[PDB]
Amino acid sequence: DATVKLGADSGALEFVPKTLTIKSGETVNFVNNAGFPHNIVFDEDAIPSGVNADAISRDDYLNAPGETYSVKLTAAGEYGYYCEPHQGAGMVGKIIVQ
Ligand SMILES: [Cu+2]
């Protein structure tokens, strides 16, 4: 399992780390750090076919400080995802599942 802080302590709205590599079946914990509310809307494109992004997409917004979203990715492949509220600011990421 690996943990992604949503936003740096400085206030910058970025996925930390932006490019994360995990193994098949590892859980990603997206812990709110700064800039909340945040959400994780996996992109339908640039992903394993079948639009699995929607099922693993966080439509709701994490608002409480330290709120953690835990998602298990078993399918191998890059997952290109982005934070909608800060999508224009470049708050995106990619999770290589092997
Ligand atoms: Cu954000």
Numbering used by the authors: 1 to 98
What wording appears in the published article?
Photosystem I (PSI) enables photo-electron transfer and regulates photosynthesis in the bioenergetic membranes of cyanobacteria and chloroplasts. Being a multi-subunit complex, its macromolecular organization affects the dynamics of photosynthetic membranes. A chloroplast photosystem I (PSI) of green algae consists of a core complex and three antenna modules: inner belt, outer belt and Lhca2-Lhca9 heterodimer, which together comprise 24 subunits.
The thylakoid membranes were solubilized with n-dodecyl-α-D-maltoside (α-DDM), followed by affinity purification, crosslinking via the chemically activated electron donor plastocyanin (Pc) and sucrose density gradient centrifugation. On the lumenal side of PSI, we observed a density corresponding to the associated electron donor Pc, whose binding has been stabilized by crosslinking. The bound Pc is found on PSI monomers and dimers. Signal subtraction, followed by focused 3D classification, allowed us to rigid body fit a model for Pc into the density at a local resolution of ~3.5 Å. In C. reinhardtii, the negatively charged residues of the Pc acidic patch are shifted by ~5 Å owing to the missing residues P58–E59, and therefore, the interaction with K101 of PsaF is weakened. Instead, the binding strength is compensated with the PsaF region K78–K92, which has six lysines (78, 81, 82, 85, 89 and 92) increasing a positively charged concentration at a distal site, thus supporting additional electrostatic interactions with the acidic residues of Pc.
